Amino acid sequence: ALDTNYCFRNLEENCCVRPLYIDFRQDLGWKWVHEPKGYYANFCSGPCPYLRSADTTHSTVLGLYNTLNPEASASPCCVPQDLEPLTILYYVGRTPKVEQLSNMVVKSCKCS
Amino acid sequence: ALDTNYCFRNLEENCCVRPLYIDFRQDLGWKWVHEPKGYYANFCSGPCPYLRSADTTHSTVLGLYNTLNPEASASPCCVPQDLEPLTILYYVGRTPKVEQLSNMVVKSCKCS
Amino acid sequence: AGAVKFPQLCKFCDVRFSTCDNQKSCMSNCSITSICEKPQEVCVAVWRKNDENITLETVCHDPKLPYHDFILEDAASPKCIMKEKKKPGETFFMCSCSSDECNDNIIF
Amino acid sequence: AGAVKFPQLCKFCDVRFSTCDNQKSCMSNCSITSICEKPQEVCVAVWRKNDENITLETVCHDPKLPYHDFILEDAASPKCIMKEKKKPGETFFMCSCSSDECNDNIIF
Amino acid sequence: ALQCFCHLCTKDNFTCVTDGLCFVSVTETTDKVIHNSSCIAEIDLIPRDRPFVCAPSSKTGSVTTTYCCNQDHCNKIEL
Amino acid sequence: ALQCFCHLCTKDNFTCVTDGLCFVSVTETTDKVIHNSSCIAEIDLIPRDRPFVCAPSSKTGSVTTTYCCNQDHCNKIEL
């Protein structure tokens, strides 16, 4: 897998994890999230050449197809491999509520 | 999920399954696959607006981010939801060999 | 069909000391934006000043239920427009509004 | 390090009747392209014609092992170039090549 | 346990059983209506008190309109 | 059971145990070398007799060079 320790260290054009900060209010319009104000959600971006962290057999097949035929406009896509949860705080009425939301932060990307 | 029964019936720009035939010899250079000559592998293509078969919570979050900010160049990606196996025949020495390779044909797409 | 009535976002700091004095517009300065507990609840802002100092109240509250022994007309309004209430030796003001964080901007 | 030697792709139809007669170049017309069973094996093509009719043979075979009581020189060659063999009342030809489907194109 | 209309649930007689809410969404751009009915689990409602997935077109971005419901088989539309 | 060098296997002391083969791949485009070492299961070798994943740069498309191996800890490179 292509993780943050490799993607943020040496930057490259091909499929990799890329930094993205999201302010709940300024970017999503969520005025209900009390804590935190924002978070690094990140995303996946970049083309998928042959054998670059291919997801399935189809990813390997379609990947090879785009290697010998790059003008076919069909290729595997840079997509999150595994994700991490974010812990948020919000108020319901008077009582504060702490929740942990899974699959919020990208840490690795693959080619599907 | 966005399947072939919906994607091939009514065609649209947004994320959907799209037809692709791959001739093993003519497109991959595989001269060893005895049967079949080629197959519909298909692929996924199209942009991912808000709530369009979103994969995870991040897909919903990043999707909403690209709805209010479409100029951010960061959005969920059209990627295979579930796949089907292809049965192939090839010769090893003199004996014919029949194998079933999983994850060869796309049938549905999602937004991750 | 029984569609779920969804509660609103209001400032919910309750009784807090405020610097809001002799002004046409005031910010709540309430860091707590809360999803109201009950679906029909609306935003409320109460401004009280005696001989000493000023207090500002921010709450979610049911429209057809008395708060400080007062009714809640104009609760369907999207903005919090304050209206004077008669109390002996007590300067009283209250607004009710049905919008997300509408009681953050208090208008006199 | 012990790198895995990978076998080649050859035509493998064995003894088949052929129309290949008095020609500088011939196609095998063997639909079976096989991954050779053993890593060191190479493509072989055997052309035989008697008083009656013609037969063409396509096989994977070990280089340093006799086929039809004959050696396999020039097996490292990428093309299948035929060479005559001495047999009484029998027109004999054989080539050996080390390339994918190289025994499909038989060159005289 | 709720019982919602599920257009995808072909083997389940077009019904799903959930501990959350029923969902509907409608896409409308130049003579087209995309109907999507399913169940949402209570863990997938964020938060349970007011899930953002249930925020209508006036809140989300006016692309599609979303409808959330707690009644049985309510998430089907017919005029 | 084979034992191959695995650069990703941090908790496994950089080793994986497989019933297939050891793998290496090298990307080379203007002063860069990407080293990738892992195990491939026998079901993922297609076919077992000659897997296409093991096809070198002369066969695949001359982008990266691939190396397959059946020896222990063989899939590491040092000059």
> Do A24 and A89 touch, CB atoms closer than 8 A?
no
Measure in Å the smallest separation between the Cα of D89 and chain F Cα atoms: 41
Torsion of CA A99, A101, A106, A108, to 10 degrees: 110
The parent domain of residue B26 ranges over 1-112
Q: Which residue of E has its CA nearest to A93?
A: E49
DSSP labels, B13-39: SSSEEE--EEEIIIII----EEE-SEE
Q: Which residue of E has its CA nearest to C9?
A: E50
DSSP 8-state secondary structure symbol assigned to residue E59: H
Measured between CB atoms, which of B62, B64, B83 is closest to A58?
B83
Closest among C56, C71, C63 to C26, alpha carbons compared:
C56
- Asked how this structure was determined, the answer is X-ray
Torsion of CA D96, D101, D102, D103, to 10 degrees: 60
Q: Domains in chain F: how many in total?
A: 1
Measure in Å the smallest separation between the Cα of C36 and chain E Cα atoms: 9
Q: Domains in chain B: how many in total?
A: 1
Q: Is the peptide bond between A36 and the residue preceding it cis, with omega within 30 degrees of 0? A: yes
Cα separation, B39 vs F28, in Å, equals 33
Q: Is the CB of D7 less than 8 angstroms away from the CB of F49?
A: yes
DSSP 8-state secondary structure symbol assigned to residue C5: P
Closest among B101, B52, B61 to B81, alpha carbons compared:
B52
Q: Is the CB of A61 less than 8 angstroms away from the CB of B28?
A: yes
Q: Is the CB of B30 less than 8 angstroms away from the CB of F47?
A: no
Q: Which residue of A has its CA nearest to C33?
A: A32
DSSP labels, D23-79: -SEEE-----EEE-SSTT-EEEEEEEE-SS-EEEEEEEE-TTS-SSS---TTTT-SS
Measure in Å the smallest separation between the Cα of D20 and chain B Cα atoms: 23
Does chain F touch chain C (at least 3 C-beta pairs within 8 Å)? no
Measure in Å the smallest separation between the Cα of D89 and chain B Cα atoms: 30
Chains linked to D by 3 or more Cβ pairs within 8 Å: B, F
> Do B17 and B7 touch, CB atoms closer than 8 A?
yes
Q: Which residue of E has its CA nearest to B12?
A: E32
- What type of residue sits at position A27? D
DSSP labels, A11-68: --SSSEEE--EEEIIIII----EEE-SEEE--EEES---TTSSB-SHHHHHHHHHHHH
Helices (DSSP H) in chain C: which residue ranges? none
Domain map of chain D by residue range? Answer: 1-108
Closest among B68, B57, B104 to B85, alpha carbons compared:
B104
> Do B31 and B42 touch, CB atoms closer than 8 A?
no
Cα separation, C79 vs F67, in Å, equals 70
Tell me the Ramachandran region of residue C22: left when phi exceeds 0, alpha when psi lies from -120 to 50, beta otherwise: left
Chains linked to C by 3 or more Cβ pairs within 8 Å: A, E
Q: Is the CB of B77 less than 8 angstroms away from the CB of A74?
A: no
> Do D64 and D76 touch, CB atoms closer than 8 A?
no
Report the SS3 class of residue F35: strand
Q: Which of residues 3-62 of F touch A (CB under 8 A)?
A: 8, 25, 46, 53, 60-61
Beta-strand pair C80-81/C105-107:
parallel
Cα separation, C34 vs E42, in Å, equals 20
**Token pair listed for B68:** 């209010």
The parent domain of residue F15 ranges over 1-79
Q: How far is CA C58 from its chain centroid?
A: 5
Phi, psi of D102 (to 5 degrees): -70, -25
> Do D32 and D78 touch, CB atoms closer than 8 A?
no
Residues in chain F within 8 Å Cβ distance of D6: 50, 54, 68
Residues in chain E within 8 Å Cβ distance of A101: 46
Q: How far is CA D104 from its chain centroid?
A: 9
Torsion of CA A92, A96, A102, A106, to 10 degrees: 110
What are the Cα distances from residue A58, in Å, to A84, B103, D1, E19, F37? 26, 6, 31, 36, 22
How deeply is A65 buried, as exposed, middle or buried, from its count of CB atoms within 10 A (0-12, 13-18, 19+)?
buried
Q: Is the CB of B91 less than 8 angstroms away from the CB of D12?
A: yes
Instruction: Mark D38-62 as b/e (b = at least 16 C-beta within 10 Å).
Output: eebbbbbbbbbbeeeeebbbbbbbe
Q: Is the CB of C101 less than 8 angstroms away from the CB of A90?
A: no
**Token pair listed for D30:** 């063997």
Cα separation, D82 vs D46, in Å, equals 9
Helix (H) or strand (E) holding D83: strand D83-87
Strand partners, C107: C25, C81
Q: Is the CB of A50 less than 8 angstroms away from the CB of F64?
A: yes
Name every residue whose Cβ is closer than 8 Å to that of residue D51 and which is 6 or more positions away in sequence: D89
Measured between CB atoms, which of B1, B50, B57 is closest to E61?
B50
Beta-strand pair E64-69/E21-27:
antiparallel
Instruction: State whether residue B6 sits within 8 Å of chain F by CB.
Output: no
Chains linked to F by 3 or more Cβ pairs within 8 Å: A, B, D
Name every residue whose Cβ is closer than 8 Å to that of residue F48 and which is 6 or more positions away in sequence: F42
Beta-strand pair E34-40/E21-27:
antiparallel
The domain that holds A43 is classified in CATH as 2.10.90.10
Q: Hey, what CATH topology would domain C1-108 get?
A: CD59 (2.10.60)
Residues in chain E within 8 Å Cβ distance of C37: 49
Instruction: Mark A8-35 as b/e (b = at least 16 C-beta within 10 Å).
Output: eeeeeebbbbbebebebeebbbbebbbe
Torsion of CA E56, E59, E64, E70, to 10 degrees: -20
Strand partners, A99: A88
Q: Which of residues 15-74 of B touch F (CB under 8 A)?
A: 29-30, 32
Cα separation, B90 vs B96, in Å, equals 6
Cα separation, E53 vs A92, in Å, equals 17
